[PDB]
């Protein structure tokens, strides 16, 4: 367990969204007072702490194709026109299907069109997943599984980020097994045993909800955290699966970061106290 916290510089496409997300997020309501029933002096001040702002950022920080960046609004209509030729056909469904769809992200909307093959005219987009700061530094980190026979153990904050990675690894190296956070039914085995074979079963995708009370084998030397967390509940317990004394080689822990984004800020940037 050697801490290496390799930052990851911007792109043009990534800043495009993040820098232009200083405007819409900057709602002109706090530091203008909209008119209510009575003197709502602090109600609107505490209508603030809209942490959706925060969480949205800490998802922008992460893989930016889980935002709405492919189907604007009207391509979901062509899906909705070219999906009623199926068993999904009730009395009146053409507005409620397009409404329920238009709140799903571009990962949920990709994960039905390729699995349920009834809308295949505009599913793929030349693999837009690979094009992302973190996935390309991850493309660089798979080269550490080229020099040597190295297997990795990879963690995820949000479930959608797993589902991105579920089809990131249908592009560079093949994928086989998605260890979800909601896999705490009764001591999992088949999803954790037949692993560590040469080149057809290399890397396996873990989650936050997957507890830290236990671990698995430490043969997996490298560990990559896609994102960074909030409190000390899984600081050390997620990051002690290769904190051993019986290893025989080097073993480095790894967590992704960004350029000049709030993710760098929650990995503290302030100042220590000379007391």
From Swiss-Prot:
Q: Where are the transmembrane segments?
A: none
Domain of life, per the record? Eukaryota
Domain (Helicase C-terminal) ranges? 137-275
Location comes to: Nucleus; Chromosome
The role this protein plays is: DNA helicase that possesses intrinsic ATP-dependent nucleosome-remodeling activity and is required for heterochromatin organization. Required for maintaining a heterochromatin chromatin structure at centromeres and subtelomeres by protecting these regions from euchromatin assembly. Enhances the nucleotide exchange activity of the pim1 guanine nucleotide exchange factor and abolishes histone-H3-mediated RanGAP inhibition. Involved in the construction of the centromeres.
Q: How does it assemble?
A: interacts with the GDP-bound form of spi1.
* Family membership noted in the UniProt record: Belongs to the SNF2/RAD54 helicase family.
What is the protein named? ATP-dependent helicase fft3
Q: Which organism is it from?
A: Schizosaccharomyces pombe (strain 972 / ATCC 24843) (Fission yeast)
Which stretch of the full sequence is covered here? Answer: 626 to 903 of 922
